[PDB]
Amino acid sequence: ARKLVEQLKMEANIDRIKVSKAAADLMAYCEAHAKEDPLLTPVPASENPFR
Amino acid sequence: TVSAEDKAAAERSKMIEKQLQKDKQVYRATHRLLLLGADNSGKSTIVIFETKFQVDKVNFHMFDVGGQRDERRKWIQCFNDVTAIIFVVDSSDYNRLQEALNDFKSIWNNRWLRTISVILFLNKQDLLAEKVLAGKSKIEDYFPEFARYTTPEDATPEPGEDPRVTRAKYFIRDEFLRISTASGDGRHYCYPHFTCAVDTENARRIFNDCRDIIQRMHLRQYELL
Amino acid sequence: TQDALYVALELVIAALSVAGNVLVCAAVGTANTLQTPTNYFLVSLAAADVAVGLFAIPFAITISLGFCTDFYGCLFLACFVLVLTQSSIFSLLAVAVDRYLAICVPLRYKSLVTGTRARGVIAVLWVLAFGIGLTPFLGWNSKDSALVKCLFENVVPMSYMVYFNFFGCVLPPLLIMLVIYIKIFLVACRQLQRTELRTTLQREIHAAKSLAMIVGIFALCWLPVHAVNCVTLFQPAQGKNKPKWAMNMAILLSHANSVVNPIVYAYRNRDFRYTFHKIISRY
Amino acid sequence: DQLRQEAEQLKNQIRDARKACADATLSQITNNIDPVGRIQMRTRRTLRGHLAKIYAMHWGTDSRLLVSASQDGKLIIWDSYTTNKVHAIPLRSSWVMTCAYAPSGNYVACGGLDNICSIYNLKTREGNVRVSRELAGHTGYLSCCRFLDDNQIVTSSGDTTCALWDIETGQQTTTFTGHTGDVMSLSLAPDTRLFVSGACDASAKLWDVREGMCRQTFTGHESDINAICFFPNGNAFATGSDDATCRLFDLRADQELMTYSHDNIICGITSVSFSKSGRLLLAGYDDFNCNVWDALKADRAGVLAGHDNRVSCLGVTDDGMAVATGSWDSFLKIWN
Numbered sequence: 001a002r003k004l005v006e007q008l009k010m011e012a013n014i015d016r017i018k019v020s021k022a023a024a025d026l027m028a029y030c031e032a033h034a035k036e037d038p039l040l041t042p043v044p045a046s047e048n049p050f051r
Numbered sequence: 052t053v054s055a056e057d058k059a060a061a062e063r064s065k066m067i068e069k070q071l072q073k074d075k076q077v078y079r080a081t082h083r084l085l086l087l088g089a090d091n092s093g094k095s096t097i098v099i100f101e102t103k104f105q106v107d108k109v110n111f112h113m114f115d116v117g118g119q120r121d122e123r124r125k126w127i128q129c130f131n132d133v134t135a136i137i138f139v140v141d142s143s144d145y146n147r148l149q150e151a152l153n154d155f156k157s158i159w160n161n162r163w164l165r166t167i168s169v170i171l172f173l174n175k176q177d178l179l180a181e182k183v184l185a186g187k188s189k190i191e192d193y194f195p196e197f198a199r200y201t202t203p204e205d206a207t208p209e210p211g212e213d214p215r216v217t218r219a220k221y222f223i224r225d226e227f228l229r230i231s232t233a234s235g236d237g238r239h240y241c242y243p244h245f246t247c248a249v250d251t252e253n254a255r256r257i258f259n260d261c262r263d264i265i266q267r268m269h270l271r272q273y274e275l276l
Numbered sequence: 277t278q279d280a281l282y283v284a285l286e287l288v289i290a291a292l293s294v295a296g297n298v299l300v301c302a303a304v305g306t307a308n309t310l311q312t313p314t315n316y317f318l319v320s321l322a323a324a325d326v327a328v329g330l331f332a333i334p335f336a337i338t339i340s341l342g343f344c345t346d347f348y349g350c351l352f353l354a355c356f357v358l359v360l361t362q363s364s365i366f367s368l369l370a371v372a373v374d375r376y377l378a379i380c381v382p383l384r385y386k387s388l389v390t391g392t393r394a395r396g397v398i399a400v401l402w403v404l405a406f407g408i409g410l411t412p413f414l415g416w417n418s419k420d421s422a423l424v425k426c427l428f429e430n431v432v433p434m435s436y437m438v439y440f441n442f443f444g445c446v447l448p449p450l451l452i453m454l455v456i457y458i459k460i461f462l463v464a465c466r467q468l469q470r471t472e473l474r475t476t477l478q479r480e481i482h483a484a485k486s487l488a489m490i491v492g493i494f495a496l497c498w499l500p501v502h503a504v505n506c507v508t509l510f511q512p513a514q515g516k517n518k519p520k521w522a523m524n525m526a527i528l529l530s531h532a533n534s535v536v537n538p539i540v541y542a543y544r545n546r547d548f549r550y551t552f553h554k555i556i557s558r559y
Numbered sequence: 560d561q562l563r564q565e566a567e568q569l570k571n572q573i574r575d576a577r578k579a580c581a582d583a584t585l586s587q588i589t590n591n592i593d594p595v596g597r598i599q600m601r602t603r604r605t606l607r608g609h610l611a612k613i614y615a616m617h618w619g620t621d622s623r624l625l626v627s628a629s630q631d632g633k634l635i636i637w638d639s640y641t642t643n644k645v646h647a648i649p650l651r652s653s654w655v656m657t658c659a660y661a662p663s664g665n666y667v668a669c670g671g672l673d674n675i676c677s678i679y680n681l682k683t684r685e686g687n688v689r690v691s692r693e694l695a696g697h698t699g700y701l702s703c704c705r706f707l708d709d710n711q712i713v714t715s716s717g718d719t720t721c722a723l724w725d726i727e728t729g730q731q732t733t734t735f736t737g738h739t740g741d742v743m744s745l746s747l748a749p750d751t752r753l754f755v756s757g758a759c760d761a762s763a764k765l766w767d768v769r770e771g772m773c774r775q776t777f778t779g780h781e782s783d784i785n786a787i788c789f790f791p792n793g794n795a796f797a798t799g800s801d802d803a804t805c806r807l808f809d810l811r812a813d814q815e816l817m818t819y820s821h822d823n824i825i826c827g828i829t830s831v832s833f834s835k836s837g838r839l840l841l842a843g844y845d846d847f848n849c850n851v852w853d854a855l856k857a858d859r860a861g862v863l864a865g866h867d868n869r870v871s872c873l874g875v876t877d878d879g880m881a882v883a884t885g886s887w888d889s890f891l892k893i894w895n
């Protein structure tokens with residue numbers, strides 16, 4: 001339809017960033033919260049509410 | 052270390068469990084059936100979304116889903132434990148018949164319904180009889196292979212009818228049985244019937260063939276069939 | 277010589293029975309899919325079999341050895357053996373009737389068999405077995421005839437086993453099982469005649485072979501003991517002089533049922549095989 | 560036609576623009592991190608009481624209660640600490656496929672094949688759970704509904720459109736109709752500003768709440784899409800398909816980043832979830848077991864094989880202490 005071609009217009013002008021920066025941000029977020037993830041590093045049984 | 056709150060919680064849980072036991076008792080002893088058809092098939096007047104009925108002190112549930120569209124492959128995964136699937140097919144319209152056969156193929160070949168039996172209801176036989184008695188029938192035009200067909204010897208025509216109507220009537224059943232015979236054996240079968248609009252014996256037929264399906268499954272479970 | 281063979285074979289039978297019958301109970305307990313109303317009768321049968329293999333046999337050699345003790349310290353062992361052996365026959369009848377009910381009454385099977393009714397039936401079966409077994413203590417003994425030599429015939433008379441434990445505790449179950457397993461065969465033959473129209477005969481022979489062994493094993497295992505008892509009771513001329521090991525062979529055949537029950541009833545079903553395969557593969 | 564030529568030109572423009580921004584592959588830049596290792600999880604509690612197959616499960620904000628729905632037509636509210644049952648709400652339709660728990664903890668939601676979304680109020684005054692509102696605007700079967708606040712809700716159905724509903728007025732405010740097939744998954748951003756949708760067209764789209772316009776689309780799958788979830792940072796999302804693959808997408812790059820798959824897996828994906836740190840991906844499968852994947856290395860970590868039928872649902876608490884798994888055996892399992 002005449003609206004479908006119009007829709008594709010705003011899907012092309014959005015600025016796009018290199019994948020390297022996104023990967024670096026993802027790595028930083030993953031490594032900045034590693035000590036508060038009980039599943040990855042199990043907590044001692046004293047503080048575990050599922051025993 | 053149990054306080055009053057824990058005791059109240061335990062009492063509430065016990066009441067809930069008792070109600071659940073009653074619900075399980077009333078639920079596990081009923082049978083479920085799913086009805087399928089197309090528009091103008093007359094699927095709403097064989098006995099609307101749900102229906103309960105009992106025969107010989109045995110319960111039966113009837114389900115119908117019609118708010119969807121032609122594609123149904125997504126919500127058919129839920130109905131993997133139904134006892135049987137009822138299929139209603141019209142026979143008055145010759146043009147809108149081949150399409151119906153296609154709708155029968157997928158149901159017979161769907162991977163989620165590999166162990167589910169199907170009960171066929173060829174509806175509107177009076178209309179077919181009147182149409183074929185009159186001279187405006189053109190069955191050969193809509194189906195080229197009808198010319199060579201002859202009535203099977205195993206057929207049991209009802210006394211007091213034209214031979215032409217019984218020939219045309221069994222012709223339609225032939226192609227519906229052909230699909231069942233081509234694929235699938237030992238897990239599910241078809242049970243043909245000739246249902247009219249005024250017939251009142253449908254419940255007995257469903258009782259009889261559902262009993263056969265259940266008996267066959269139970270015989271197969273002990274590995275002696 | 278003969279006694280050594282008898283006791284050794286009894287010990288071997290007890291060991292095999294306990295080893296085979298612990299597995300069925302463990303599998304039923306540890307599997308959620310096998311917690312069905314049908315499997316409760318099977319687990320009751322397995323429990324009766326393992327209890328027999330753990331208690332009845334050693335008591336049997338204790339009785340048959342021929343040592344001296346008090347009169348009432350021997351009847352207790354005899355009655356315990358009788359109770360433990362009768363429970364197995366009652367469980368076999370229960371599983372037979374459960375099997376018949378599903379096939380010959382298909383639509384009303386679910387509404388008639390529930391956990392509550394199955395538990396009640398099992399409790400009644402065990403209570404009736406205990407009641408039948410302990411009847412001699414009520415006064416059906418041989419004290420007036422006769423510190424006391426422990427032989428099975430000295431404590432409990434032959435007027436009890438033939439008339440009460442055979443004519444009212446063994447034969448009617450066999451007749452009921454025969455009727456049930458003939459009717460099921462007829463139903464299966466009709467359903468195959470309808471199906472066909474391999475060959476029909478090659479699938480009829482398989483069903484006949486499968487249904488025949490259940491009754492044949494029971495008939496081979498239980499009849500000879502009571503046949504010998506009837507021979508002893510009725511005609512004394514033949515009964516008085518017979519080889520000793522003839523009675524021992526009957527005892528062995530009667531106690532050999534505990535190792536053949538799980539193979540016929542439990543290991544053949546598909547659900548048990550699937551659960552065993554999954555457990556073996558995982559472990 | 561001229562219109563199709565313009566569409567082809569625009570599609571090629573989009574393709575080359577996407578190709579231009581590709582800097583480096585993830586494998587070359589992930590080859591220096593320390594591997595997670597082997598993760599072993601054991602079942603702690605098994606919750607029984609359901610009759611039929613179980614189709615949905617949602618946790619709460621306090622990581623204390625959960626809600627379960629089954630084909631028997633009943634909602635159960637549990638307490639995972641002591642395996643109690645706080646409430647059991649009967650339903651009007653036996654067919655249900657959606658559940659939701661309000662962040663404030665006063666409301667629950669349900670929906671199914673009856674084309675109507677039902678809202679139930681929990682903290683009442685008379686002591687009985689009473690239905691508050693019913694929404695009946697869609698024309699297809701609902702697939703998933705998630706709350707935004709105490710007075711707004713978002714729903715997706717088989718009518719190839721998604722909708723936003725305001726509870727008090729009862730009339731929807733904005734509908735999104737860019738899709739061409741059955742939409743059957745959606746997840747919300749942590750800041751409650753955008754949300755993603757996955758359709759039956761092997762495609763996913765990201766929508767804006769107040770704008771009401773599709774802002775960015777992603778494709779690459781070859782079959783149906785069954786589940787989708789949001790990364791904790793709000794800048795990525797992972798999707799699962801019937802091609803037995805999981806695919807990770809970034810929003811700022813408009814491109815694929817990672818693909819998790821193996822040659823020994825043939826069944827389909829039915830549920831996907833993330834962890835608190837974003838280092839772990841949990842995926843339920845069709846072969847009676849779940850799997851754990853490393854989001855930055857594309858390697859297996861462990862198998863949570865403890866079920867006997869399909870594992871339909873999957874959830875992770877806000878604090879990440881436990882993982883809940885439902886199945887078609889009418890059983891729920893809690894792992895830690």
Ligand SMILES: CCNC(=O)[C@H]1O[C@@H](n2cnc3c(N)ncnc32)[C@H](O)[C@@H]1O
Nearest residue numbers: 357358361362428429441501527530531
């Ligand atoms: C329910 C019937 N049970 C028995 O016959 C058991 O009793 C024992 N038994 C019965 N009659 C005799 C006998 N005459 N001598 C030794 N044991 C016997 C057998 O070992 C059987 O296992």
